[PDB]
C-alpha cells in the first residue's frame, strides 16, 4: 500500500488541503492509499481526523485515514513523510506560535525591533527561533534518523520552518532523503497579471534559496520582458496599494530591490530585504504601503490571533460534525472543503510524480549540485526541477543570477544559514553571541549577553537552556 | 640591465629600506642594477634620491639610481615595479594621509566611529578610502595597463593599500602580473618568543587573506603546540601589557578570537576583529590594553603627526647632506642607514628569487588556485609560497582553516572585497549605500545619504564626485 504520513496533522487547514488534493488525484485516490495523521495535541488531532474523514466521504474517495499519537507508528514503512509540526512546551503553551511571540517581545525589550530572529534578508516572522531553531531542528533530525531505520525509501517533505536551515542540516548531518517545500514562487503570477500578460505566453524561471528567489528569466514573445516591468514602475507603481498585509510582490520595496539587483525578488523574498525597508513601522509603511507588510508589531499579533480563532472554530466544526452527521461540509463551507479544484500547492503533485510518474515542474529545496556553479554543490537551494519516478531533475538556470544577487544577497543569506547550523551543532552560546555581534541593532556586547540570558530563562526554554549549558 | 622602479619613492624610509637591501644583496648590487625612483612630489622625491645616493656610496655599492617625475619613464622596460604611492589632490593636500583623516572625521560627525572605512574585520586605519578606494584603485589600474604595454615581463609588486582589493581588481580586470605584499605574518615570531620557543624548532604555517591570516599550523617537537598557548593564556595573559599602540599580537582581543575560531589571528588580523572589540575607546582599551591599539581617535592622529615630522626631518637631512657632503649617514643615523643587516621585508628577496633563482619562502597575495579548496580559484589570498626563477609555488595549507574562520571571518571579508570592487567598477553610488546599509552603525537610510553627500562634497574629492555622478 501507499502510506502518506502527516506529522503535525493538527495543522488543520493544511491537513485538509493535503487530504482533499489526494482525494481528487485519480492515481492516488485509492483504497491502497493510507493517510496517517499524527500529532501530539489530542484535541487538534481529533478535529483534523473527523473533518478529514467526513471530507473524504463527501468526495466519494476510498482513501483510508488513520490517526495516531505515535511518531514511530506514523513513520514506520511510510512512503512519504510530510513534516508540518511546530513544537512547543505543553506545560506552558498550546501551540508553537506562542514561544516565538514571547521571545520576540523580549528581544524588543532589549532593543531588537521584531526580535533577534528578524535579521537582514530574513524578516519572515517565525522563520527561525532564537537563531538556531533548536526545537524545530531537533524534531526534524529525530524524524530523519527514525526514517533511515524504519522507512529507508521515504521522502521527508519538510514544510516547517526554517526550511533552508533544516533541509541543509538533515542532508548534511544524516544523509536522510529530505526535500524542502515552499510555494513562494507563486508570486510570479501576480507580476504577469499586473503587466497584462497571459502566463501561458511568458517564458520564465526563478531560482535562489528559500525565501530568497529571483525572477532570473522573464521573457515574452521572444524578447526580454523586464522592459515591461520598467514601464509599469514608471506608470503604475505610484498608484499601487496593497490589498492586505501579505500583498508585497509589486510594492516599492520589491521594485527598489529590482533596480539594485537587476532581477525582481519573488514572493517572501520581498519581505526579506535589507534593513533599509524595516528600521521601524513608519519605514515599513513607506516601502510596503499602508499595512507595513505582515512582519511588524501590529499586523503579526493580529494575524496570530486570527489563526487562534480559526483553530478553535475548526475544532468546534469537528464537534458539530459529530452531533450532526447529516451536514455536508463541501456545501456549508466550500472554501475550506472544495471539490473539483485542486489547491495548487506542490506536495501532492510531488507525491504523484514520484509514485505514479505524473511528471511535473516544481520549485523545491535541494542540493545545488552545480546548478548555480558559483556556490558549493552541497548547499540547499530553491530550484526549478522536474520530478518523475526517476527522481528530481534540476533545470539549467539561465540567465544566471546577477553578480549583485550573488555577493550582496545569496552569499550573505547562505552564510547566515551556516552560522545558524553552527550555533545548533556546537551547542555553543558564543556562536549565538557572534551572530548578534554581526547584527546592526547591537550597541554593546553586554546587551547581547543580557538579551540571550532573558530568552534562555523563559520557563518554556528549559530544554534550550540545558542544551546550551 | 635589471630595472627596479619605485613608484611613490617619496616614501622615504621605505625607499631607503629597498635601496639598502638591494645594495646588500650580492646578486643585485651590480652596475647593471638600475633603481628608478619616481614620485609626483618634487621635494620628497629629491630628498629620497639624495639620501639613497649617499647611502649607496657609503655602502660601496655600484647600483645606479635614477629619479624621474614621469610614471611612463619609470615603467618603460622595468623588470619590477613596486607601487607604494598614496595619491592626493595637490591643490589642497601635501600627502595622502590627509584625505583619509578628513573623511574619517566627517564619518564620525555623522555617527560612524572611526569613519565609514572602519568596518567589521577591517579596522586597519587608511586601508580603504570611501569604501571603494577610488584614487588608489585608479592609480593601480593605470599602472597595470601601462605595464602590459611598456613592460610585459614586469612584476607589479603592490604595497599600497587596499592590497586585497587592488590586487584582486588588477588581476581580474587587466590580467596584469600583480602580486600583493604585506609582512603581517611576522607576528608569529612574537608568539614564539612569549612561549619561550626557538623559532627554528617550530613547524608553523599561516594563511588567509591580507590582514586576515591565521596560524593554521603550530607544532613543536612532533605535537600540536597550541596547548602551550593555552597555558600562556591561563598563566601570562592577565599580566600582559602592550609595549606601544601597535603591540596587539598577544592581547586579550587576539586570545578571544583564538578561543572562538580555534586558530590565532596573526599580525594586523588582530586589529581586524568584529565590532565586539571596537565599539568605543573604552572597549578598545579593555581588549587591546592601555593605548586602545592604534586605530582610535587618540593614537592614530598622534601617529600621522609623527610621520609628518619624520617626513620633514628626512627632507632636512637631505639638505644637510648637500651642505655637508663629508658626513657619513651610516654613522650619524645607523637606525635609518644600517649596514650588514638586511631589513627583513619580502620585496628584495622576492626580486632576488625571481631574477637570480635565490629560492625563498614568502607570504604573498596571489590567486587561490585551489589552495583553500572551499573558496573560488580567482580570489586573491595571502598564502605561504616558495618563489624562484620558475615563478610562485603555493604550499599546501594543512591543517585547513577551521570551519568558523571560513563562515564567520574569511567569507564575510571576501564579500566585502567584492562589494568594494563592485562599488568601484559600477561607478554607482547605490552600491556604496548598500555597503552602509550592511553597517551596524547605520540608524537610517537618510543618514547614509547625508554622510556620503558630505564626503563627496569635500573639495579634494572633486574627481571622486564626478566619477560617481
Ligand atoms: N508550505 C505550506 O503549505 C505550509 C507550511 N507550514 C509551516 O509549518 C510550520 C507550522 O505552521 P502551522 O501549521 O500553522 O503551526 P501549528 O502550530 O498550527 O501546527 C503545528 C502542529 O504541529 C503539532 N506538533 C507540535 N509538535 C509536534 C510533534 N513533536 N510531533 C507531531 N506534531 C507536533 C502541533 O500540535 C500542531 O498541531 C510553519 O513554519 C509553517 O510555515 C504549515 C502549513 C502549510
Ligand atoms: N609593506 C611595506 O613595507 C610598506 C607599505 N606601504 C603602504 O603604501 C601606502 C602609502 O604609505 P606611505 O608610504 O607611508 O604614504 P606616503 O604619503 O608617505 O607615500 C606616498 C608617496 O607616494 C607619492 N605619490 C602620490 N601619488 C603618486 C602618484 N600618482 N605617482 C607616484 N607617486 C605618488 C606621494 O607623493 C608620496 O611621496 C600605505 O598604504 C602603506 O601601508 C608604504 C611603506 C612600506
From TrEMBL, chains A, B:
Mn(2+) binds at residues 182, 211. Its cofactor is Mn(2+); NAD(+). Disulfide bonds join 389-390. GO terms for biological process: carbohydrate metabolic process. GO terms for molecular function: hydrolase activity, hydrolyzing O-glycosyl compounds; metal ion binding; nucleotide binding; oxidoreductase activity, acting on the CH-OH group of donors, NAD or NADP as acceptor. NAD(+) binds at residues 11, 39, 41, 86, 161, 311. Keywords: Carbohydrate metabolism, Cobalt, Glycosidase, Hydrolase, Iron, Manganese, Metal-binding, NAD, Nickel, Nucleotide-binding. The record marks 120 as: Increases basicity of active site Tyr. The modification Cysteine sulfinic acid (-SO2H) is found at residue 182. InterPro entries: Alpha-glycosidase, GH4_Enzyme_sf, Glyco_hydro_4, Glyco_hydro_4_C, Lactate_DH/Glyco_Ohase_4_C, NAD(P)-bd_dom_sf. Beta-D-glucuronate binds at residues 13, 161, 268, 271, 300. Binds 1 NAD(+) per subunit. Substrate binds at residue 161. GO terms for cellular component: cytosol. The keyword Hydrolase applies. The modification Cysteine sulfenic acid (-SOH) is found at residue 182. Residues 206-442 form the Glycosyl hydrolase family 4 C-terminal domain. The keyword Metal-binding applies. NADH binds at residues 11-13, 39, 44, 86, 159, 161, 181, 311. NCBIfam families: alpha_gluc_AglA (NF041089). Belongs to the glycosyl hydrolase 4 family. This is Alpha-glucosidase, putative. The lineage of its organism: Bacteria, Thermotogati, Thermotogota, Thermotogae, Thermotogales.
